Write a protein that binds this ligand. Structure first.
Ligand SMILES: Nc1nc2c(ncn2[C@@H]2O[C@@H]3COP(=O)(O)O[C@H]4[C@@H](O)[C@H](n5cnc6c(=O)[nH]c(N)nc65)O[C@@H]4COP(=O)(O)O[C@H]3[C@H]2O)c(=O)[nH]1
Ligand SMILES: Nc1nc2c(ncn2[C@@H]2O[C@@H]3COP(=O)(O)O[C@H]4[C@@H](O)[C@H](n5cnc6c(=O)[nH]c(N)nc65)O[C@@H]4COP(=O)(O)O[C@H]3[C@H]2O)c(=O)[nH]1
Ligand SMILES: Nc1nc2c(ncn2[C@@H]2O[C@@H]3COP(=O)(O)O[C@H]4[C@@H](O)[C@H](n5cnc6c(=O)[nH]c(N)nc65)O[C@@H]4COP(=O)(O)O[C@H]3[C@H]2O)c(=O)[nH]1
Ligand SMILES: Nc1nc2c(ncn2[C@@H]2O[C@@H]3COP(=O)(O)O[C@H]4[C@@H](O)[C@H](n5cnc6c(=O)[nH]c(N)nc65)O[C@@H]4COP(=O)(O)O[C@H]3[C@H]2O)c(=O)[nH]1
Ligand SMILES: Nc1nc2c(ncn2[C@@H]2O[C@@H]3COP(=O)(O)O[C@H]4[C@@H](O)[C@H](n5cnc6c(=O)[nH]c(N)nc65)O[C@@H]4COP(=O)(O)O[C@H]3[C@H]2O)c(=O)[nH]1
Ligand SMILES: Nc1nc2c(ncn2[C@@H]2O[C@@H]3COP(=O)(O)O[C@H]4[C@@H](O)[C@H](n5cnc6c(=O)[nH]c(N)nc65)O[C@@H]4COP(=O)(O)O[C@H]3[C@H]2O)c(=O)[nH]1
Ligand SMILES: Nc1nc2c(ncn2[C@@H]2O[C@@H]3COP(=O)(O)O[C@H]4[C@@H](O)[C@H](n5cnc6c(=O)[nH]c(N)nc65)O[C@@H]4COP(=O)(O)O[C@H]3[C@H]2O)c(=O)[nH]1
Ligand SMILES: Nc1nc2c(ncn2[C@@H]2O[C@@H]3COP(=O)(O)O[C@H]4[C@@H](O)[C@H](n5cnc6c(=O)[nH]c(N)nc65)O[C@@H]4COP(=O)(O)O[C@H]3[C@H]2O)c(=O)[nH]1
Ligand SMILES: Nc1nc2c(ncn2[C@@H]2O[C@@H]3COP(=O)(O)O[C@H]4[C@@H](O)[C@H](n5cnc6c(=O)[nH]c(N)nc65)O[C@@H]4COP(=O)(O)O[C@H]3[C@H]2O)c(=O)[nH]1
Ligand SMILES: Nc1nc2c(ncn2[C@@H]2O[C@@H]3COP(=O)(O)O[C@H]4[C@@H](O)[C@H](n5cnc6c(=O)[nH]c(N)nc65)O[C@@H]4COP(=O)(O)O[C@H]3[C@H]2O)c(=O)[nH]1
Ligand SMILES: Nc1nc2c(ncn2[C@@H]2O[C@@H]3COP(=O)(O)O[C@H]4[C@@H](O)[C@H](n5cnc6c(=O)[nH]c(N)nc65)O[C@@H]4COP(=O)(O)O[C@H]3[C@H]2O)c(=O)[nH]1
Lengths: 256, 256, 256, 256, 256, 256
């Protein structure tokens, strides 16, 4: 497809070793999972996996980042409106819970997802149903829940904004991501992984010379694995077939 | 092997078309062939072919450029010395006529090959034999003769140095090469041919960007196809995997 | 996808060199471009490029050949009908200007596009808006315009049918295509380009022997690059894996 | 290398299944093996295997077909002459027993190998040594023996020519080859095996259309697997890249 | 796409040879074809072919297995409902005859397709039209008919359930499939065919060792080619990159 | 060829980074180089490189491990005997200094190379010549010297056995290898490097599952890179095409 994320649990480091260990624990289960760590540390891929090697791989998988949807529509996107009961609901659409009936569904920066919405959220993981936008009726739903916030919820609770009964039911399996800069053993490795995706995205393929590679083991990766993903995609279309490096990368990681 | 010459009769141009036409004429035959044209215009390859699609492909093929051998040894290299009859002949070696018995044998810049030697040469293509260094005996030899001089023999005759009975027996099939710079339709074409050899010579492979390619269609090629061959080999080891161009080639063909 | 056009600005010839030169001129710009030349001389590809290496590659690209659409619908296809204001408009569709908001949009044989329609056309490149089918309202539109007529407009003007103010605003960048038969240096080249597309279209791959290739450098190509494209596609499905040639091509280019 | 034999124990048929069964029996052993069957039924390959999956793969393997060597030299080729003790022995050469010390050594059409020579042969597999040409000395030799005659020895014994004590020591493990025409399940299979060798022998690769393949399942194969090997090699150089068939093969197997 | 069926008329055996012979007979024709044999013996592929090498390949191809659709909807799926004339017909859908106008349409286990429906069926292959769900109007239709029942119709007729005038018009070309277990020459062959599909379905590729292959030539294949297809797909995702066998397959075909 | 060593300066770790740094220092030079570190830590490859990116790549390279040659012959192997001046010198052979005239020559565990021999050694790097076995004559020699001892020479000096003037002239460029177990960042990396060699050594190719890989990052590598090289070669012939791991490796690195 067009996604921009890949095989990403490749790795030597003990860092990523133990995050794989984490994954073993919880992989038999239908119970909820919470992924914590900085953004762009490959959370989605961690989830996407849990799906496949679940008992429900044959079903669907819905990602929804609560970030990018505005606040007002957030309810219909998730639950669904029968045409008319929402001022300007022209379509009899389905929510993502409708959609994910069968497989699992993925939630991004839950710490973002508003106080009003997270209440209803509590229901459906206790209620076993939900009511569409403007409907007195409850609908049966088999769905496994995975969610990922970049933020700390222990402090989201004290501050109020997060309800301590959501949290109680989502921490059956904590998994804690490691930032890429704690994983530098593993740079090289997935860089291979990368051009092996991209080689079949665009005309061409690149290759990093050792010069720029060490240089990439230098950097911060505040944006982590996602940041790097963006970067490799750029050059793979920018100079295709070419070597890469030595200093053909952004003037930023010009590192000694 | 380690040779540095290739598939080289690739080509659109009428120039190389008619040199292929030439090849058709003479390809059924066991009779001698003379190839004329500048050096490094791929003569050898023209011969090497005539061999394969002869009736004798299953036999051998000996190249000898009269240039690079010194003058004194020229006779033993070609005819062979029984140990002792040459002051310091420690080995009972064979000549190239011994060697090429069966297949064919290739002679470079015949215009170079000394007056003394070319006399004996006349013999064996009339004599049907030759005598080794220091031997009263004649040896039966089945060999087809191909030869290539960069120089004009019509003027080698008037000036003396070439015997008009050699020439009479070698022009059963003239073939006249076209200099590469008369063949620029065909640059691109064999450039492909080239990295397809070299890709399996060294680690890597290159690729020319369109920038440098037009730039290569500019140049003289005084050294012709051979010159270009040397050039592609250089960069294929120099920067491997990389793009080539735009101006990574020698400061020479920096051409607008 | 299923298109049947490719990498096609491959080429040695000065012909295609200067048509690439043309492309350099106008590639920074948002201003209109007019491509002139015979049909099937690869015009679309010339446009498609200008898009990618524009500032708007990330947007869309809409091709519409005024030829194949009938005359009556031509307005709604381009501007769009709100259900009902067109006798039998059941759908609230969008036009191609709606569609191309963001990227650029491509027009074929403008010399065909009727007198009535080209008037409205003038508006939107001056008006900065357009009104849908049966709507009193104007809609803001950011779109760059490229168009290609096989016909001569200087004579389309004298004859009347083309308005001299369209033409004034479309000739900011003329580009003039070269017919394939003026580009025979370049046949071979893109023939490679071709089986390298098609090899991943169908089971198999072909290859042209030198016999049929020279034979293809013979031909007219009244249909030019498009004609050849059709031809290679045919055999690539007709005899797959096979050699091609010598006379397995249509009895037409049977050429000495 | 240049051999012309391959992976050839590929196969569905019960015929070749049981000849593989045979191979299992005897594969642990250092004791002699006799392979019986028509020529060109791939005997050598059957041996070559037994070597590799012996305990001595790390050693050498010498093939000698008693056929192609003349009768007089047969002794020195096998045992070796110290320069001078053979009228015209200029070289202090080694025999094949010298040579195969370590690995194993392969003998073809033993039924051919003369009465005089097979006597000495008996010695070394009992004697544990041999004496070079013109030497009073015996030399220690560790060698495993495999041999293959196209002919029946039970009748070679009655007729005299074969000694009943050779035979007694060589039938520790009989293996009996199946003629290719008893193995037609398996044609297709190794035909794949074939172009997968040859594809890396010469420029190109071929492919058989279904037409000619059934046609090849028709034929006798008096020459068996070897015959077919010769055949595939021919076309792989004859028409390269091309389809093969339908009737591009020799006018012989033109079969309905 | 996601189908799970392939190149499947690969084969040595006389069994599959004559089923290919069958295909030759009827391939010029627009007249109806009936395919008989057990399920999962690759019927669809036999049809899909007849399409391509028909005169109508450029058109569409609709498969409909009368099995999996319930009984009540069977009419609208095939003929199509204008919104409203069917209690709960919200959509103005098309039938498969609408759909297949142009190409051909495929019917599975006709022996299943109910008495009521097969009457109307008779009409359209005589009537040259059909009437949508709840419409007094007849619609012109150019469609070629192929159908496949696992069951015997001669006994479907005596028992009643099948009308002897359907049958009369469908047996212009009988083709009779051979069960896979009558085709064991051909196992190996298409197994190759298989990983060559699947290698481009999922990450990886497998390979069968000879151990498990003979073991697969053992089995029943009550499910025939389809059964095997399911099987190869399983392991290709189960253990990817790995060898397969020896006993990594289901405990079922554990065969001596 | 048949060597069993590869591309081996692949690596993330600071360990191997600084050993590459070392290499930069000394790469312009003709002066002697000493490589210290445990055996099997890839010393040869470190040298082999220095050659290529020297000014003398176009020349030869001779490896001689003083270990495996016995003590008595050590002089002729290095210097060369004219037939007769050594009791049983039948051949007029050349030494390795003869041989390496032009390129460079490599010496293994110099700490092994006997007191007698290392004296003469001193000469030639001061003398600029050497005398063959049994010759009053000195021969001019242009050779660059690289040598590698597993042992510590500072203590080889105190103990006597190593002469403090050898050492003075060999430490123009020290390079100090890092044991593989200090380089575990880099395991994975060169493991790739490995099957990419071996894939073209034997039929097949393997692949390590993540299971066994972490397990390989566990181990000691007393034998270091060489040890691992031996290991990968083993399985690449042992189980070919297969996965490797999880515990198909020797019962030794069975590591938790
Ligand atoms: N188009 C394409 N996209 C790719 C490829 N590799 C990774 N991706 C994308 O990036 C994610 C990487 O997943 P993973 O870590 O390999 O983790 C994968 C892998 O663990 C496994 N998996 C997924 N598909 C297959 C498959 O077809 N065969 C096998 N053997 N395993 C699979 O389940 C997870 C499912 O991942 P996804 O949900 O697909 O999510 C995948 C996929 O969506 C690829 O080769 N092609
Ligand atoms: N010389 C030549 N080769 C061709 C052509 N079309 C396809 N190929 C070859 O086919 C491979 C895959 O083509 P694909 O299936 O479209 O798969 C393509 C396609 O998925 C995508 N892609 C590459 N270039 C373009 C492009 O210009 N436009 C679009 N839309 N997609 C592209 O990337 C994939 C791989 O491209 P590559 O890495 O080049 O690898 C390409 C290239 O080897 C052609 O017109 N000329
Ligand atoms: N990563 C990795 N890949 C390896 C290694 N060894 C072989 N390969 C792969 O195998 C291909 C051919 O190896 P080859 O048979 O030796 O054939 C080689 C060999 O003939 C020659 N060659 C390349 N590099 C060297 C080198 O450093 N030394 C020598 N002596 N020959 C080389 O060029 C051919 C092709 O080299 P490539 O173009 O790279 O293509 C190589 C490369 O893809 C390795 O140690 N590491
Ligand atoms: N599926 C497929 N289709 C192909 C391929 N190559 C060409 N085509 C089709 O034919 C047109 C040829 O474009 P171009 O001359 O290569 O000119 C291309 C090329 O100049 C550049 N371009 C397009 N896509 C890519 C890409 O993915 N990577 C890079 N590096 N350049 C691209 O922009 C132009 C965009 O062309 P398009 O609009 O795609 O239009 C492309 C594409 O639509 C291919 O490999 N795969
Ligand atoms: N032996 C065998 N090999 C298979 C099979 N399926 C796929 N392959 C191999 O996979 C390559 C690409 O398959 P693909 O992804 O479908 O990509 C295919 C697909 O895009 C298209 N294609 C080829 N044949 C057909 C066909 O019969 N029907 C359809 N719908 N598409 C086809 O062309 C592409 C390349 O086909 P190829 O050139 O053959 O190259 C094929 C072929 O090497 C199979 O069933 N048997
Ligand atoms: N150059 C080349 N020649 C080939 C190839 N395949 C077969 N041949 C020639 O044909 C014979 C076929 O042997 P096999 O039946 O595969 O039987 C082979 C196979 O059973 C096994 N074997 C040999 N070499 C290797 C290897 O490198 N790796 C593995 N895994 N097995 C081997 O031992 C037997 C040894 O056969 P050979 O004595 O070599 O004799 C081989 C070989 O000499 C090939 O891929 N390349
Ligand atoms: N276009 C082009 N491609 C080249 C050239 N040289 C090598 N290749 C490519 O490299 C592959 C292997 O080359 P190789 O290592 O010499 O391995 C060669 C070589 O071993 C042998 N071979 C092929 N043609 C010839 C020839 O004309 N003369 C000789 N002596 N050997 C040949 O067959 C192998 C494979 O040939 P292919 O099947 O073509 O596969 C070739 C071809 O893909 C070239 O000059 N032009
Ligand atoms: N994606 C993909 N799918 C494949 C491939 N090979 C087979 N299939 C699927 O499995 C069926 C096998 O068809 P077939 O026996 O090869 O029989 C094929 C073959 O006989 C021929 N055919 C189909 N497409 C092509 C093509 O693109 N090129 C050529 N030369 N022949 C084709 O017509 C029949 C049409 O088959 P389909 O209706 O496509 O149905 C194909 C296709 O739907 C493949 O390589 N890629
Ligand atoms: N190391 C690495 N290699 C990659 C990656 N993405 C693509 N490749 C390489 O690209 C080939 C085809 O990728 P594709 O076009 O997506 O075509 C893929 C895709 O169609 C499908 N596929 C494989 N794995 C997955 C997966 O995890 N998820 C999904 N959705 N599809 C997959 O199977 C095809 C072939 O997969 P392969 O057999 O592996 O063959 C793959 C693999 O060689 C990656 O993230 N990492
Ligand atoms: N057959 C084969 N053998 C291989 C290959 N790669 C490595 N080896 C063996 O292992 C050594 C690894 O060298 P390196 O670290 O790549 O270091 C290499 C590399 O740095 C460079 N080099 C050597 N050959 C080539 C070449 O053909 N092209 C380029 N670009 N560089 C080369 O010089 C060094 C010379 O190494 P060697 O003396 O050859 O020693 C090489 C070579 O002998 C390969 O692909 N094929
Ligand atoms: N099915 C089949 N395929 C063949 C055969 N011969 C060659 N190939 C293919 O050709 C590739 C290289 O063959 P190669 O040039 O001999 O290069 C061979 C050769 O150098 C060596 N090799 C492999 N097997 C053997 C063997 O059994 N005996 C010997 N002596 N060498 C082998 O390893 C290289 C690569 O072998 P692969 O990894 O298999 O990769 C092989 C394999 O893909 C054959 O008889 N049957």
């Amino acid at each position: 497809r067009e996604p921009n994320l890949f095989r990403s649990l490749v790795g030597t480091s003990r860092a990523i070793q133990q995050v794989r260990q984490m994954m073993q624990q919880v992989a038999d289960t239908d119970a909820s999972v919470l992924i914590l760590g900085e953004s762009g540390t490959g959370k989605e891929v961690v989830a996407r996996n849990l799906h496949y090697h679940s008992k429900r791989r044959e079903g669907p998988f819905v990602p929804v980042n609560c970030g990018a949807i505005p606040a007002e529509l957030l309810e219909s996107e998730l639950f669904g409106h029968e045409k008319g009961a929402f001022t300007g609901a022209i379509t009899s659409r389905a929510g993502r819970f409708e959609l994910a009936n069968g497989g699992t569904l993925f939630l991004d920066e839950i710490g973002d997802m508003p106080l009003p919405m997270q209440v209803k959220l509590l229901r459906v993981l206790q209620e076993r149903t939900f009511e569409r936008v403007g409907s007195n009726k409850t609908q049966n739903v088999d769905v496994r829940i995975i969610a990922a916030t970049h933020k700390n919820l222990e402090k989201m609770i004290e501050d109020g904004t997060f309800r301590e009964d959501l949290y109680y039911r989502l921490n059956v399996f904590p998994i804690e991501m490691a930032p890429l800069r704690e994983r530098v053993e593993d740079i090289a490795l997935l860089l291979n992984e990368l051009i092996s995706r991209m080689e079949h995205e665009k005309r061409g393929s690149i290759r990093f010379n050792s010069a720029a590679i060490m240089s990439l083991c230098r950097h911060d990766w505040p944006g982590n694995v996602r940041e790097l993903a963006n970067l490799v995609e750029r050059l793979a279309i920018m100079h295709p077939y070419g070597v890469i490096g030595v200093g053909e990368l952004p003037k930023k990681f010009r590192h000694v």
